[PDB]
């Protein structure tokens, strides 16, 4: 049972898989750069300096790795590199212990599909006592075991001796990340994505001079591919994280810069770099063509091949006369329909019986596939994958480009137009520029119904109509969510806040993503004002997508009694005219005490008053209230964060929170004093005694009389 | 071990009724569909769709006011972590 | 049984509007039912 699972699909090529991607993540001053340089120098026997941008090396005959030192204070970089990564070398200061950046990143990974996390602890050489050392390692390990699973192992790294960590511990780390054995995840194996390796602008410099350093320059992007075969026909939509949502102009594949030695030697075999074994560019050292030729008429196509409206349904036939004369007989279709003589009779009877039964009980697949419904499903998957394999292998140029496009691990360059000068200007190498092919559902806009809860570690709850910078799909954008409840599934009422410890429905405007999709939203992407508080604020999953919602806010009208009889009351101060009351006549009105009612007829001489009947003599002091609903609407704000376009690449400031603007404008948190609660103290009430009419009291008999 | 097919009683009105607490999962070593409890409609929220739940026996000792009979399994772990852990906010469900 | 304290939290009791200290002690369901029982008692004995 333990080894069963939920069948999925592994869309990765057997043939030339790409370099796996390892993201080195953690707090700022924690030996992250040294860790990468030492890992590289172990795996390729070459000390390195000036590391920046994705650095791709090769391990073993069949593996190769892409290291990304993610920046140490950018929440947006954390989010997107965690969307894309595969192995997270998550690293921890030792003398200090766990840190908020680490916790935030771990949460992002957990919500977007956890990659193979793998923790390494540094600064272990500053412990004075080997006892505190041991206790602290054990505590880190167990807290880590809570976050990542249990038994997950972390590595320990004493001090740098010569700008490098000890060879033994690094050797163990290297072999582990050499037999890592990654696993399939829905988002990655449903989208195509790449992590750009090199960036090159493209315009003509005189054209730049003429336009005035403003024209939106063409851009070339070089890198491998991952996930799902990118369609090779130009003009697909790819979101570049933090830069915008573009569409590709021109595609082209190339020879990869660091081919695995197995591939290299197999290439040398077929035909009949050893010194640069790494790659850090961002650092320094026929019917078918007849079908699809457009300039040809379909008539021309068909005549050449042999040598019409589609609205009508019946296809084009010939004269019944010719038809019947042609087929007085059916022998030309009898084949489709269905001692030595005795043996032939037995064989034809077997054929008849095989047509009769056939694939009715052809092995059931079950005893064939080891009697485990999981493995049966998995066998279906694998058989489909191998069908794909052989059909693609059938033919070279089209099956590879026109049919499926560039599979994965195929080092491609792409050029876009209309890319901001700000991007090309402020682009520094230390940030990952990641691209993801979108989907139609993901290019449309509408409003999404999700369910989200306040993130358990965030100290404050989330008010409606306060902007939330959420991350969903490849995107990060700021929106105005509205949090709704279903009053036991009668209507969708807006709440004023977020339940402290449970999931409330939310609805908000923004780009659409397929249902059942997880997402997580923060409040402050700006490094400038983060404080010591935990950053991630909301987590949820999108349930459904549409273009509008019926969403209700409650409002009650308050009225006041001023002349009461038994069961009838005159209510003033609730409407403004007799037309108004007459529109509202016949209403379930109930008072604070809880006695039901209705408003019967609009009173005449006073302008708005009315007479209402209750189920009991209402007080004079009570208050009557009428429940009614009011439709609200969802704000259509959408402000997609673009830190890469920004120059600081942190302190992206968007819409401010309500409390923030109130403090800035020096207002007060509004509150009318009659809405507050108070410690009332209800005293006992002595009711008057009965008083019989004098008529009755005179008519009573003598015994049962008040003596 | 099972796969959550669909949550029954999403549309029922009174909260925390048995037909709210119920889901429907197919056991994977048979491909065989069976229904199963989940305490706490909150936990009903913690379990959503295609989730690889770990089911256990119910072993109820005495009936309740409106307990559905004939529902013998209860969900224990969802996508690999404990329902009580998630509910108590010790852990967080990893997608 | 299996319920959070916050799920059991509390609900405070809002009091009469400030603009009516003249009509004191807005009436709630406990007091209404008390008085209703009393009045039913009186009606019963008068019918007797």
């Amino acid at each position: 049972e333990r080894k069963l699972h939920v069948p999925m699909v592994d869309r990765t090529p057997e043939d030339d898989p790409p370099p796996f991607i390892v993201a080195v993540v953690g707090p700022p001053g924690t030996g992250k750069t040294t860790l990468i340089r030492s890992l590289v120098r172990r795996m390729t026997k070459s000390t390195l300096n000036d590391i920046q941008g994705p650095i791709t090396v090769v391990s073993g005959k069949h593996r190769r790795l892409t290291f990304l030192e993610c920046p140490a204070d950018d929440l947006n970089a954390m989010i997107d590199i965690a969307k894309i990564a595969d192995l997270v070398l998550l690293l921890i200061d030792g003398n200090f212990g766990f840190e908020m950046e680490t916790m935030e990143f771990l949460n992002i990974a957990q919500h977007h599909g956890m990659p193979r996390v793998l923790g390494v602890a540094t600064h272990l050489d500053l412990f004075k006592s080997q006892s505190t050392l041991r206790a602290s390692k054990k505590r880190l390990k167990h807290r880590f075991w809570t976050e990542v699973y249990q038994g997950a192992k972390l590595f320990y790294l004493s001090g740098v001796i010569n700008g490098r960590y000890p060879d033994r511990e690094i050797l163990n780390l290297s072999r582990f990340i050499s037999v890592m054995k990654f696993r399939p995840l829905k988002w990655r194996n449903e989208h195509p994505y790449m992590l750009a390796d090199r960036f090159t602008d493209l315009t003509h410099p005189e054209l730049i001079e003429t336009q005035g350093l403003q024209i939106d320059r063409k851009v070339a992007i070089y890198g491998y591919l991952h996930g799902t075969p990118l369609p090779s026909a130009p003009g697909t939509r790819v979101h570049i994280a933090g830069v915008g949502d573009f569409s590709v102009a021109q595609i082209e594949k190339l020879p990869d810069p660091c081919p695995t030695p197995f591939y290299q030697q197999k290439l040398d075999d077929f035909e009949r770099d050893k010194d640069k074994l790494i790659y850090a560019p961002m650092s320094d050292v026929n019917i078918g063509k007849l079908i699809y030729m457009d300039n040809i008429s379909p008539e021309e196509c068909i005549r050449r091949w042999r040598g019409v409206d589609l609205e009508k349904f019946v296809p084009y036939f010939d004269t019944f006369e010719k038809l019947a004369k042609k087929w007085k007989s059916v022998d030309a279709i009898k084949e489709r329909f269905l001692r030595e003589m005795n043996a032939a009779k037995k064989e034809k009877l077997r054929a008849q019986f095989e047509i009769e039964e056939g694939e009715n009980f052809k092995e059931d697949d079950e005893n064939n596939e080891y009697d485990t419904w999981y493995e049966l499903q998995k066998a279906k998957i694998s058989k489909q994958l191998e069908i794909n394999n052989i059909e693609y292998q059938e033919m070279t140029p089209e099956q590879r480009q026109r049919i499926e496009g560039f599979k994965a691990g195929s080092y491609v360059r792409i050029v876009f137009e209309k890319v901001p000068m700000e991007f090309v200007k402020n682009f520094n190498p230390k940030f990952p520029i990641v691209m993801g092919g979108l989907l139609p559902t993901e290019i449309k806009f509408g409003i999404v119904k999700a369910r989200l809860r306040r993130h358990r570690w965030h100290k404050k709850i989330l008010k409606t109509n306060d902007p939330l910078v959420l991350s969903l799909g490849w995107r990060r954008f700021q929106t105005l969510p509205i949090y709704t409840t279903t009053d036991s599934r009668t209507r969708t009422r807006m709440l004023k806040y977020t339940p402290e410890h449970t999931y409330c429905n939310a609805a908000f405007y923004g780009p659409l993503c397929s249902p059942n999709t997880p997402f997580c939203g923060v409040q402050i992407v700006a490094n400038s004002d983060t404080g010591n508080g935990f950053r991630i604020a909301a987590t949820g999953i999108v349930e459904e997508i549409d273009v509008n919602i019926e969403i209700v806010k409650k409002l009650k009208l308050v009225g006041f009694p001023y002349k009461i009889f038994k069961n009838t009351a005159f209510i003033k101060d609730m409407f403004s005219s007799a037309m108004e009351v007459a529109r509202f006549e016949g209403a379930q009105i109930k008072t604070v005490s809880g006695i039901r009612g209705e408003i019967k007829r609009a009173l005449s001489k006073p302008e708005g008053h009315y007479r209402a009947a209750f189920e009991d003599k209402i007080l004079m002091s009570d208050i009557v209230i009428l429940r009614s609903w009011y439709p609200v609407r969802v704000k259509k704000f959408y402000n997609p964060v673009t830190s890469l376009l920004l120059k600081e690449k942190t302190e992206w400031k968007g819409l401010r929170l309500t409390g923030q603007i109130r403090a800035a404008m020096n207002l007060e948190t509004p509150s009318n004093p009659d809405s507050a609660y108070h410690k009332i103290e209800r005293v006992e009430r002595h009711f008057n005694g009965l008083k019989v009419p004098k008529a009755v009291q005179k008519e009573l008999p003598f015994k049962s009389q008040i003596h | 071990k099972g796969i959550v097919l669909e949550k029954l009683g999403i549309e029922s009105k009174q909260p925390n009724s048995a037909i709210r607490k119920c889901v429907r999962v197919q056991l994977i070593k048979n491909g065989k569909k069976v229904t199963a409890f989940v305490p706490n409609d909150g936990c009903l929220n913690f379990v959503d769709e295609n989730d690889e739940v770990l089911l256990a026996g119910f072993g109820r000792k005495g009936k309740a006011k409106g307990d559905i009979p004939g529902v013998r399994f209860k969900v224990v772990k969802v996508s690999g972590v404990s329902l009580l852990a998630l509910w108590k906010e010790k852990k967080e469900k990893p997608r | 049984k299996l319920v959070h304290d916050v799920q059991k939290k509390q609900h405070r009791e809002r009091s009469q509007l400030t603009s009516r200290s003249r009509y004191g002690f807005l009436e709630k369901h406990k007091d209404y039912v008390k008085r209703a029982q009393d009045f039913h008692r009186k009606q019963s004995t008068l019918k007797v």
């Binding site: 700022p28 916790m103 807290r143 809570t146 358990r456 570690w457 | - | 304290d5």
Partner: peptide
């Protein structure tokens, strides 16, 4: 210092326990 140490809450991870004595 610029480092943001983790909160006690998230250190100890006692999620939702009732009141005790």
């Amino acid at each position: 210092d610029g480092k943001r140490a983790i909160n006690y809450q998230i250190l100890k991870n006692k999620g939702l326990t009732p009141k005790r004595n």
